[PDB]
Design a binder for these strands. Structure first.
Lengths: 125, 251, 91, 50, 282, 445
RNA sequence: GUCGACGUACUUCAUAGGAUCAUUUCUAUAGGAAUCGUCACUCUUUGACUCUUCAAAAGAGCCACUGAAUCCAACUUGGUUGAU
RNA sequence: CAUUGGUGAGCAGCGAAGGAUUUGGUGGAUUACUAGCUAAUAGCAAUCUAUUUCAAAGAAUUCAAACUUGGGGGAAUGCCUUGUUGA
RNA sequence: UGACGGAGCCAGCGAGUCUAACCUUGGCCGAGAGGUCUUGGUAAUCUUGUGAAACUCCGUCGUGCUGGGGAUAUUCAACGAGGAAUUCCUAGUAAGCGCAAGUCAUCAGCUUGCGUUGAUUACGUCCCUGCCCUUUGUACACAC
C-alpha cells in the first residue's frame, strides 16, 4: 500500500538489500541503527551516502538494509552501495527526476562505485 | 527544461518549485518591493529578476550565488527575456524600454517615445524588433539594432497585450474592449521593411549590402556567376561523353 | 543429408521459426497464444529494438537476443517473484 | 536437477508466479494450509467462530 | 555470449545424437551405393523400402581432426593459459614456467583466489583456447589438466618421472621456436583422440629446418614427454636434451570444461575392474 | 572495403575468417589500420590497410560490438557493446592494453571527442554518458528519454507513452568544438545538447508526414472501428491495374529490402547524425532523405557586448571617418552580416595587416568563419586571400594553441583555397606552360 | 602381419481360404436391406453469445454535459417490551 | 521481535449547505475552417415534368489480351496449339 | 607489530540408514560364546551446518636469549629473522588468515577446494642477455 523501493549492493560476497519507503527518517542496518555499523573506522564509508547529499533527503524516508555474506569491509561497501542506489531509485520513482539525476551526479562525482560495482574479473593477459 | 517554476511575490522573494513534484526547491530573497519579472537562461545557468524597486538582479542558478545587481532609474513593471540572444527588455516607469543583456549586465539600448504607461511588449522571434503597446493608444515597433522606432499604429482601443508568434508569422494583440484576440500578420515575412525611423545607405536601411564588383583595379576578381563555369568550359567534351545514353535511341 | 531438402522442408518448419513459437519454446510464454498477445502488447524486443508483429522469423544466431523490454511489467513480476528486483535500473 | 539449474533461462514467465512467492533465502514458500482455504479469516468469521 | 555458447553446445550435442541415431541410413545407403557400383542384388530390407531409394536420388552426392578442434584446426593459432593449483610451492611455479616455455602461444597466470568457474568464464570470453592446470605434491608436480575452451574436452593426466630444467644445471636458454612433433604408437581411437588434444596446442606449420622437437611416445599408457634440439651431422643426427622430461598417464577425459564435472565422460581409468592390467588404452 | 575517391576504384577488400556480417567500422587517423565490429561475433577485427591481412582479432566483449571509434589524437580504440560495457584498447606499441568501463545498460552509438579526451556513449536506458578516457571515470551524463518524441504506430495496441520502441538514441555525434552532441534514433525527434551543462539546446521534429508511421503520438479515434483501424485495411485491390494490385510481401520481414516486401508503413527513424566539419550544420539520415539543418547569420540579431553607442549608424560613421579597426570591431559587436561585409570590403589593401594584427582575440573565430562562408562563393579571390594571409601571419599562433575553437573555421578556409583558388592557379599554370612550349619549340612542316 | 579355396557356424526369404469397402447405379456377386415433399414432443452432441477462473497483460487516450450503482457521513423509521 | 501480510475498532491532522469509488450515454477535438442537391458556365432547395426530344460527334486485324500457377510425376475424357480428312 | 585477561563481530565450500580410538582394574550373570556394569592410564585435525581466524574494543604488565649430575634451605650444546649465490613474481596479483573436503590417477609425513584481508613497484625499452622474423613492397589506389 506504501510507496516502497528495493535495491541491492554488492562487493565480493557480501550482499545488502535495502528497502526504502516513505516515513519519519530512520536508517536501520540489520535491525540496529546505522550508527552501530562496525568496524567503526569505516562508519564514514557507510555515512557518505548521507553526508554527500544532506540529511534533508533522508528526513522524509526510512531505509532498512539486510546484509548477509562477506566480511567487514565487504559488508560496509555493500551497505553504502545499497543506500546510495536506493536513494536514487526512490527519488526517481516517487520524487522528481531532477532530484534523481542531481543525486546521480553527486554520487558519480564522488565515486561511481557507490552506484555500479566492479564485478567480473580477471584479465587473461 | 520544464523542471522548474519560479514565483515572484509582492514582498520581493523568488521561490523556485519543481513542476513535476510540486515542492519548494529554493528561495532567493534579494528584492524588498514587488518582483515583477523573473526569467532564466536557455541553459538554466543564469537567472534574471527585476522588481519595482528598480534593481535587476543577476543570479547564477546552478550555484545559488548572485552574479550582480544593477540599479535602474525607475521602478520596473515588466520583463521579457529573449532567450536565444540573451537580451531582456524592461518597461520602466519613466516610460522607456531598457534593453539590457544578461551576459555582461549592461544597458545596451534605451527606447524613448511612449507618452503613457507601457501596457505590454514582446520581442521578435529573431530578436531583432521589439513591439510595445501603451495607454496612449499606440503600438510601436523598435529596431533594437539601430535603436529607433520603425512603425507606429494609433489604434482606438488601448492594446493591453502584445505577443509575437514563436515563428515570425503573426502578432496577437488584445485590447480593452472586444472579447476576442486581434491578429496581425507581419508583411516583413514576405517583403523587407526599411529600418528608417518614423515620426508624428538605402541598402543599410534595408539591411543588405550588395557586394561591389571589384574592390580595386590591382586586385584579381573572378566572374559574377557560378564557379563551375570554368570547369564546364575546360572539360565539356568528357562531361557530354559521360552524359550520352548507353545505346543509340530508336528514331 | 540432402533428402532434408525435399522431405524436411515444410511450412511448419518455417512456422516454428516464428517469434511466438521461439518464445514458447524458450519458456518465455506459457502458450503460443500468450506469446502472440505479449508481442502484440509490445513486451518483446530482439536485440535493442522492439518487435511488434507475430510473424517475425528468428534465425539461430538471432534467438540469443530475444528478451523482454526493460520497464516491462512481465520482467518486473518475474524479478519480483524471485525478489531479485532492483529498482535502480527500473526493474 | 543441477543441469536444470544450469539451464533455467531467466526470462521465464508463468502466470502462477503472481500467486506463488518466495521467502528471504530464495526458496519456495509453500503454504501449509489449504490452497482451497485462506490462512487468514475475516473479522465476522472470527466473530462467528468465537 | 552465455546464451549463444550454451545453445551452441546444445545444438552440437543434438546433432551428434542425431548422427549416432541415424547412422544406419549412412551404411545402408552405402550398401545400395556399392550395389549400383557392382551390379549385385540388394537385400530384402533395402529392397522393399521405397522411401529410401527416392531419397537416394537426392543423397547420391554425399561423402583426422574431430568435432571440437575441426572448425579452426590450422586456421588459427592456439592461446594457452598455464596456471597452478592454488597457493603453489616454488617448484610448482618453476614447473609452470617450464610448461609455458614448452608450449608456444602460452602465457602463465598467477593463481590465488581465482575460482575455477569465473576463471573459465574469463578465459573463454577473453579468447583463450586451452588451460593447463598443474598440481603438485611437496614440490613434485603430480597432475596436469588440459581444458580446450569452447566447450571442448578436458584431458586429465598424472605426471610420474619428473626431472626439471631448473633442477638440472645452467645449460643455457631454451629455443622457443615452433617445434616439430613426434607421436609414437598412438594406435587406438583413444590414442588419436589424445594426440589431437595434445597437438592442437602447438602452432600449425613449423619450419622444415626448425631445430627443436618434442616427442610424445606411448609406452603402455605412459606417454614419455621429452624435448630435444638437433643438428644433422655428416653421419647421423645429434640429439641434445633440453627442457623437462616426464611421463604422463591419462586417467580421465571428459567432454566439458573444467568447472562442472557434470560433463559426459568419454574415457576414465577403470582401476579396480577384474581385467584392469590386461589391456592398454583400456 | 576501401574506395579511392580519385580513381574511383575499390582497391582493398577485407574479410574475416568466420563468415560474419559487419555492422560498424573505425579507421586509424594515420590510416594504417581499419577496424570493424559485428553484431553476431563479439570480436573486433583489425586489418592493416597497407597490406591486406587480418592483423588481429580483439576479444573481450561478451556481447555484440555495437560501435567502434578511434580517438583522432592519441589513437586509442574505443568499442562499446550490448554487454553494457564500453572498452578502451591501447593497440599501438607493445601495450595490448584493455580498460573496460562498465555502464548501466547496453550501449549503442559510442562517439569520441575531437581531442580524444572523452567518449560519449548512448545507452538503451535513454541516456548519454560521458567518460574521461585516460582516467576511466564518468564525467557526466544527459538524461534524454523524456525529451524524445516517440509516435504511435498504426498497428500497435499500446500508447506512445508506454511504448519502449524508441526512447533512446541509436546515433550520437560530437560537435567539432567538442561542446555539443547531436543525437537521433528510431524516433522522429533529433535532439542536441551542450555537454558542459547537460541541457537540451534544441529538439527537431524530423517528419510531420502522416504517411510515415511513428509520427503522430495520438491517432485519430475516428479511424478506429469495430474491427481494427481503417488504415490497416489494405485497399490494394481497388487499384486500376495489376502491378499494384499485386501483393508480393513475404510475411515477417522487417528491414529487408524492396519496400513492396514489408506490408507495413515505413516508420520514421534517423539512422546516422553527423556535424559538418566546416560550417555549423548537421546532416541526419532519416527515412525521407538526408535532412540538413543549418544556421545562417543573416537573421537572428545576436550581438556580442554592444553598448548604446554601438550602432550601424556609428559603424558607418567610423568607416567614413576611416577608423577601420574600430569599424570592424563595431560590426563584430553588432554581429550583423551585412555590416561585417560592408566594413570588410571597405578596408583598403594598404592596411589589411595592421587591422588583422590589431583584431582582438575574441573576434578571431568570427572573422575566420565569416571569411570562410564569404569566400566560398565571393568573387574577390585576391582580397580574401590577402585577408587570410594577414590573419594567419598576424595571429597564427593563437589558432595553433586554440585548435578546437578554430577547427571548423580553418577547415572552411582551406575549403576555399584548394577548391576555387587552387583550381584557378592550376589553369593559369597550364596556360603559362603551354605558352612556353608553343613559342619556345619548333613547328616547321 | 594380407587376401583366396575347403570346412564350420549364422541370418533372411514361403503364401492360402473367405468376407467387406473402394465406379455420383454396378469392384462382377443375383442367397442381399433400405425409393414416402414435417406436424409435434423428449433426450443427447456441438458452436456461438454474455460474464468469469487458473491469471495475468494492454487499454484510440482528452475535455464537457447527463443518467446510474456501491461505500461512508447525515437524516428518517423499526429496535434490549430484542436489531443482527 | 519483525511483517515493506489480510480483516477490522478507533484518534490526531485535512475539512465552506457533504466525501470516495465505479459505470452507461451523448457532444466537442483527435490534419489547416471556402456551405446542400442535380443531368452543373446554371438551376433547384415547395419539383422536375406536359421541351428531355432531335441533330452532331463517337466502332484499331489490339477481329490481341491470366505480366495473377505451392513442389515432383502424369493427363483416359477434357482444354490449348499445330497439322490433316471430309464438306 | 609483544605478553596476560575479558568483550563485539563478519564468510563461502561440504549432507550415502552414513563418521569412525587403544590399553587396563575389578563385580555379577552364563555350560561356553559372551553379555552387562565398574575402573585408571594413553591418544586426539572431534563428532554434519551453530561457528572461522586475521580483525575491532576495553583493563594489566613492560622490553639486554638458553642446560644438566655438583652445591644452601655459580660455571662447560643450539639459537635473537638466516652469507655467497640462486629462483619466482605484475590486480583481487604477492603476501597474511582460517574453514571444509579427500571424488577410480596422485595425495594424508599431505593434497585439492573455499571464502576473509589485500598491497609496493613496472606497465617503458631493445641499452645488456637471449629467442624469433625479414631482406623484390606486391596486395589495387594515394603517399613513401
Amino acid at each position: 500500500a506504501v510507496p516502497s523501493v528495493q535495491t541491492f549492493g554488492k562487493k565480493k560476497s557480501a550482499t545488502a538489500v535495502a528497502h526504502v519507503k516513505a516515513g519519519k527518517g530512520l536508517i536501520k542496518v540489520n535491525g540496529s541503527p546505522i550508527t552501530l555499523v562496525e568496524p567503526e573506522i569505516l562508519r564514514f564509508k557507510v555515512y557518505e551516502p548521507l553526508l554527500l547529499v544532506g540529511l534533508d533527503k533522508f528526513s522524509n524516508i526510512d531505509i532498512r538494509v539486510r546484509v548477509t555474506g562477506g566480511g567487514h569491509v565487504s559488508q560496509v561497501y555493500a551497505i553504502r552501495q545499497a543506500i546510495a542506489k536506493g536513494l536514487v531509485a526512490y527519488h526517481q520513482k516517487y520524487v522528481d527526476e531532477q532530484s534523481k539525476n542531481e543525486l546521480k551526479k553527486a554520487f558519480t562525482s564522488y565515486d561511481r562505485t557507490l552506484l555500479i560495482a566492479d564485478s567480473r574479473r580477471p584479465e587473461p593477459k | 527544461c520544464g523542471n522548474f517554476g519560479f514565483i515572484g511575490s509582492s514582498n520581493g522573494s523568488i521561490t523556485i518549485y519543481n513542476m513535476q513534484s510540486g515542492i519548494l526547491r529554493k528561495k532567493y530573497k534579494l528584492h524588498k518591493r514587488a518582483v515583477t519579472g523573473i526569467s532564466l537562461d536557455g541553459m538554466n545557468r543564469k537567472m534574471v529578476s527585476c522588481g519595482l524597486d528598480g534593481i535587476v538582479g543577476f543570479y547564477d542558478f546552478n550555484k545559488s550565488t548572485l552574479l550582480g545587481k544593477l540599479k535602474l532609474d525607475a521602478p520596473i513593471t515588466a520583463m521579457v527575456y529573449h532567450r536565444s540572444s540573451d537580451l531582456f527588455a524592461l518597461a520602466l516607469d519613466d516610460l522607456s524600454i531598457v534593453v539590457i543583456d544578461a551576459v555582461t549586465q549592461r544597458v545596451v539600448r534605451q527606447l524613448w517615445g511612449h507618452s503613457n504607461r507601457i501596457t505590454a511588449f514582446d520581442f521578435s522571434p529573431e530578436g531583432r524588433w521589439i513591439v510595445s503597446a501603451s495607454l496612449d493608444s499606440t503600438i510601436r515597433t523598435w529596431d533594437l539594432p539601430t535603436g529607433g522606432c520603425i512603425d507606429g499604429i494609433i489604434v482606438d482601443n488601448v492594446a493591453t497585450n502584445v505577443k509575437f508568434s514563436p515563428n515570425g508569422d503573426l502578432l496577437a494583440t488584445t485590447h480593452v474592449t472586444g472579447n476576442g484576440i486581434c491578429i496581425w500578420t507581419n508583411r516583413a515575412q514576405f517583403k523587407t521593411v526599411s529600418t528608417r525611423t518614423i515620426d508624428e545607405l538605402n541598402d543599410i536601411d534595408f539591411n543588405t549590402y550588395t557586394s561591389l564588383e571589384q574592390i580595386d583595379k590591382e586586385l584579381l576578381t573572378l566572374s559574377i556567376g557560378p564557379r563551375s563555369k570554368m570547369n564546364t568550359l575546360l572539360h565539356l567534351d568528357v562531361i557530354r561523353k559521360r552524359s550520352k545514353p548507353k545505346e543509340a535511341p530508336k528514331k | 543429408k540432402i533428402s532434408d531438402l525435399e522431405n524436411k522442408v515444410t511450412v511448419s518448419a518455417i512456422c516454428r521459426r516464428r517469434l511466438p513459437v521461439i518464445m514458447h519454446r524458450l519458456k518465455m510464454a506459457e502458450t503460443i497464444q500468450d506469446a502472440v498477445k505479449f508481442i502484440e502488447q509490445g513486451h518483446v524486443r530482439v536485440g535493442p529494438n522492439l518487435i511488434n508483429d507475430p510473424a517475425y522469423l528468428v534465425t539461430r544466431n538471432m534467438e540469443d537476443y530475444v528478451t523482454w523490454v526493460d520497464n516491462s511489467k512481465i520482467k518486473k513480476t518475474l524479478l519480483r517473484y524471485r525478489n531479485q528486483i532492483d529498482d535502480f535500473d527500473f526493474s | 536437477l543441477r543441469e536444470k539449474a544450469k539451464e533455467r533461462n531467466p526470462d521465464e514467465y508463468y502466470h502462477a508466479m503472481h500467486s506463488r512467492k518466495t521467502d528471504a533465502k530464495g526458496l519456495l514458500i509453500s503454504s501449509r494450509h489449504g490452497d482451497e482455504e485462506d490462512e487468514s479469516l475475516s473479522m465476522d468469521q472470527v466473530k462467528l467462530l468465537k | 555470449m552465455l546464451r549463444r555458447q550454451a545453445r551452441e553446445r546444445r545444438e552440437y550435442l543434438y546433432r551428434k545424437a542425431q548422427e549416432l541415431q541415424d547412422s544406419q541410413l549412412q551404411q545402408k545407403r552405402q550398401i545400395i551405393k556399392q550395389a549400383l557400383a557392382q551390379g549385385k542384388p540388394l537385400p530384402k530390407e533395402l529392397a522393399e523400402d521405397e522411401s529410401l531409394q527416392k531419397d537416394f536420388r537426392y543423397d547420391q552426392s554425399l561423402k583426422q581432426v574431430d568435432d571440437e578442434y575441426a572448425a579452426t584446426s590450422g586456421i588459427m593459432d592456439p592461446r594457452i593459459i598455464v596456471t597452478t593449483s592454488r597457493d603453489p610451492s616454488t617448484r610448482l611455479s618453476q614447473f609452470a614456467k617450464e610448461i609455458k616455455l614448452l608450449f608456444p602461444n602460452a602465457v602463465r597466470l598467477n593463481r590465488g583466489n581465482y575460482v575455477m568457474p569465473n576463471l573459465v568464464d574469463a578465459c573463454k570470453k577473453s579468447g583463450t583456447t586451452d588451460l593447463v592446470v598443474l598440481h603438485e605434491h611437496r614440490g613434485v608436480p603430480t597432475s596436469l589438466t588440459i581444458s580446450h575452451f569452447p566447450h571442448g574436452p578436458t584431458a586429465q593426466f598424472s605426471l610420474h618421472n619428473v626431472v626439471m630444467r631448473h633442477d638440472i644445471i645452467n645449460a643455457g636458454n631454451q629455443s622457443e621456436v615452433n617445434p616439430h612433433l613426434i607421436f609414437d604408437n598412438f594406435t587406438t581411437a583413444l590414442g588419436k583422440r589424445v594426440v589431437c588434444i595434445l597437438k592442437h596446442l602447438f602452432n600449425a606449420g613449423p619450419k622444415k629446418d626448425s631445430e627443436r622437437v618434442i616427442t610424445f611416445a606411448n609406452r603402455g599408457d605412459f606417454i614419455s614427454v621429452r624435448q630435444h634440439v638437433y643438428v644433422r651431422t655428416r653421419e647421423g643426427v645429434e640429439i641434445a636434451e633440453v627442457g623437462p622430461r616426464f611421463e604422463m598417464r591419462l586417467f580421465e577425459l571428459r567432454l566439458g570444461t573444467l568447472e562442472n564435472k557434470d560433463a559426459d565422460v568419454e574415457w576414465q581409468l577403470r582401476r579396480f575392474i577384474r581385467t584392469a592390467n590386461k589391456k592398454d588404452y583400456l | 572495403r576501401a574506395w579511392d575517391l580519385i580513381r574511383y576504384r575499390n582497391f582493398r577488400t577485407f574479410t574475416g575468417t568466420e563468415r560474419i556480417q559487419f555492422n560498424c567500422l573505425a579507421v586509424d587517423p594515420s590510416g594504417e589500420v581499419v577496424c570493424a565490429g559485428s553484431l553476431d561475433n563479439f570480436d573486433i577485427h583489425v586489418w592493416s590497410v597497407q597490406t591486406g591481412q587480418l592483423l588481429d582479432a580483439l576479444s573481450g566483449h561478451e556481447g555484440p560490438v555495437s560501435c567502434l571509434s578511434f580517438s583522432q589524437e592519441n589513437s586509442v580504440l574505443a568499442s562499446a557493446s550490448w554487454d553494457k560495457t564500453i572498452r578502451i584498447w591501447s593497440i599501438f606499441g607493445r601495450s595490448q592494453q584493455v580498460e573496460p568501463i562498465e555502464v548501466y545498460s547496453d550501449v549503442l552509438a559510442l562517439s569520441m571527442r575531437p581531442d580524444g579526451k572523452e567518449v560519449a556513449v548512448s545507452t538503451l536506458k535513454g541516456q548519454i554518458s560521458i567518460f574521461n578516457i585516460e582516467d576511466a571515470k564518468q564525467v557526466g551524463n544527459i538524461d534524454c528519454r523524456k525529451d524524445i518524441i516517440s509516435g504511435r504506430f498504426n498497428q500497435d495496441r499500446f500508447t506512445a507513452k508506454n511504448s519502449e520502441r524508441s526512447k533512446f538514441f541509436t546515433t550520437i555525434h560530437y560537435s567539432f568544438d567538442g561542446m555539443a552532441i547531436v543525437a537521433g534514433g528510431n524516433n522522429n525527434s533529433i535532439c542536441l545538447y551542450d555537454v558542459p551543462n547537460e541541457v537540451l539546446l534544441k529538439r527537431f521534429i524530423v517528419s510531420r508526414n502522416m504517411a510515415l508511421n511513428g509520427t503522430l503520438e495520438f491517432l485519430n479515434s475516428k479511424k478506429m472501428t469495430e474491427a481494427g483501424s481503417l488504415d490497416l485495411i489494405d485497399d490494394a485491390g481497388e487499384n486500376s491495374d495489376l502491378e499494384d494490385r499485386i501483393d508480393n510481401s513475404l510475411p515477417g520481414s522487417q528491414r529487408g529490402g524492396d519496400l513492396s516486401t514489408r506490408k507495413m508503413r515505413p516508420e520514421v527513424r534517423v539512422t546516422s547524425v553527423q556535424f559538418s566539419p566546416t560550417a555549423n550544420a548537421f546532416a541526419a539520415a532519416s527515412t525521407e532523405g538526408l535532412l540538413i539543418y543549418s544556421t545562417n547569420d543573416t537573421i537572428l540579431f545576436d550581438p556580442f557586448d554592444l553598448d548604446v553607442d554601438v550602432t550601424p549608424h556609428s559603424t558607418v560613421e567610423a568607416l567614413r571617418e576611416k577608423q577601420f579597426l574600430n569599424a570592424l570591431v563595431m560590426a563584430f559587436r553588432l554581429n550583423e552580416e551585412y555590416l561585417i561585409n560592408k566594413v570588410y570590403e571597405a578596408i583598403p589593401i594598404k592596411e589589411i595587416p595592421l587591422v588583422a594584427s590589431n583584431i582582438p582575440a575574441i573576434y578571431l573565430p568570427r572573422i575566420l568563419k565569416f571569411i570562410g562562408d564569404f569566400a566560398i562563393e565571393s568573387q574577390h579571390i585576391e582580397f580574401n586571400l590577402i585577408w587570410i594571409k594577414a590573419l594567419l601571419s598576424a595571429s597564427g599562433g593563437y589558432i595553433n594553441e586554440h585548435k578546437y575553437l578554430f577547427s571548423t573555421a580553418m577547415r572552411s578556409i582551406q575549403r576555399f583555397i584548394v577548391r576555387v583558388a587552387k583550381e584557378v592557379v592550376n589553369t593559369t599554370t597550364d596556360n603559362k606552360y603551354t605558352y612556353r612550349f608553343l613559342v619556345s619549340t619548333d613547328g616547321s612542316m
